[PDB]
XYZ file of C-alpha atoms in Angstrom:
133
model
C 0.000 0.000 0.000
C 0.827 3.700 -0.402
C -0.731 7.019 0.613
C -2.463 8.277 -2.538
C -4.422 10.993 -0.763
C -4.529 14.507 -2.041
C -5.871 17.027 -4.480
C -4.326 16.332 -7.864
C -4.131 18.404 -11.054
C -3.897 16.601 -14.415
C -0.491 17.164 -15.955
C -0.270 14.593 -18.774
C -2.773 12.378 -20.562
C -1.950 9.861 -23.294
C -4.461 7.846 -25.340
C -7.619 9.025 -23.602
C -9.120 8.804 -27.120
C -8.419 5.074 -27.391
C -9.845 4.344 -23.947
C -13.029 6.277 -24.755
C -13.331 4.586 -28.165
C -13.108 1.223 -26.421
C -16.093 2.316 -24.297
C -18.105 3.571 -27.284
C -18.253 7.173 -26.075
C -19.777 9.302 -28.796
C -17.832 11.778 -30.875
C -19.147 14.984 -29.284
C -18.596 13.647 -25.765
C -15.014 12.557 -26.507
C -14.231 16.054 -27.775
C -15.522 17.662 -24.570
C -13.885 15.098 -22.298
C -10.447 15.722 -23.827
C -10.635 19.501 -23.410
C -11.460 19.114 -19.765
C -8.746 18.333 -17.316
C -10.739 17.169 -14.278
C -9.123 17.307 -10.876
C -8.627 14.064 -8.948
C -9.301 14.179 -5.202
C -8.392 11.062 -3.241
C -9.671 10.608 0.316
C -7.983 7.616 1.936
C -8.594 6.223 5.412
C -7.235 2.749 5.949
C -9.019 0.498 3.463
C -11.681 3.131 2.726
C -11.419 5.391 -0.320
C -13.430 8.074 -1.994
C -12.006 9.119 -5.370
C -13.493 12.249 -6.918
C -13.058 13.213 -10.571
C -14.299 16.765 -10.687
C -14.985 18.939 -13.710
C -17.260 21.911 -14.297
C -19.588 19.639 -16.247
C -19.971 17.013 -13.534
C -18.299 16.254 -10.237
C -18.457 12.530 -9.679
C -16.952 10.057 -7.317
C -16.535 6.434 -6.472
C -16.500 5.180 -2.889
C -15.171 1.746 -1.996
C -13.226 -0.355 0.445
C -10.251 -2.402 -0.694
C -11.339 -6.013 -1.095
C -15.088 -5.220 -1.172
C -16.923 -5.811 -4.452
C -19.292 -3.079 -5.555
C -21.485 -2.450 -8.548
C -21.007 0.626 -10.746
C -23.808 1.708 -13.100
C -21.487 4.102 -15.029
C -24.351 6.526 -15.703
C -21.939 9.383 -16.376
C -19.741 7.453 -18.825
C -20.935 4.481 -20.933
C -23.957 3.415 -18.842
C -22.713 -0.185 -18.594
C -23.038 -1.939 -15.270
C -19.837 -3.431 -13.870
C -19.043 -5.344 -10.708
C -15.842 -3.736 -9.474
C -13.137 -4.821 -7.045
C -10.144 -2.791 -5.855
C -7.086 -4.489 -4.347
C -3.437 -3.652 -3.741
C -0.883 -5.011 -6.237
C 2.128 -4.168 -4.069
C 1.868 -0.345 -3.902
C -0.436 -0.085 -6.948
C -4.143 0.303 -6.242
C -5.826 -1.826 -8.909
C -9.479 -1.995 -9.926
C -10.999 -4.802 -12.008
C -14.345 -3.754 -13.532
C -16.131 -7.000 -14.456
C -18.762 -6.702 -17.149
C -19.357 -6.737 -20.883
C -16.077 -5.128 -21.908
C -12.934 -7.221 -21.556
C -9.910 -6.212 -19.491
C -11.591 -3.091 -18.103
C -10.194 -1.373 -15.024
C -7.777 1.173 -13.660
C -4.625 1.432 -11.576
C -3.249 4.241 -9.393
C 0.220 4.544 -7.884
C 2.523 7.283 -6.644
C 6.151 7.970 -7.558
C 7.679 10.300 -5.032
C 4.818 12.744 -4.859
C 3.557 12.378 -8.477
C 0.294 10.474 -8.953
C -0.068 8.033 -11.833
C -3.244 6.586 -13.321
C -3.858 4.008 -16.013
C -7.422 3.544 -17.269
C -7.829 0.600 -19.612
C -10.412 -1.260 -21.627
C -10.145 -3.745 -24.493
C -6.340 -3.285 -24.753
C -6.553 0.495 -24.931
C -4.593 2.087 -22.093
C -4.878 5.751 -21.156
C -1.935 6.901 -19.043
C -2.322 10.016 -16.912
C -0.115 11.764 -14.398
C -0.938 14.444 -11.848
C 0.793 16.950 -9.585
C -0.269 17.788 -6.024
C -2.055 21.120 -6.299
């Protein structure tokens, strides 16, 4: 495990297009999503997390405990229901989103004080990094 907590500003984003294409996000929505740079806010208390992804268009969040399965309806994204599980892979916080799409999930980790995120679906990986701000 690692302390991922903080308020995080998006600093780099690679292949968000491919990730969104894998989810079937429509053309107009992909355009808007790429221009945004939502802030990530991670609240971490033991095994309990709330991860906020906040933009002017919509603040949203996911709340979970490590090791505790939870459904996600994904109303703000692709509207596909997944059964999600978050566990530690050494110091990488890893989510498996079980559902229609194959190999769907995300991973967070921290390098020094720089937050990393991979979001992936169908072999498309979006890599993002953030600075504490």
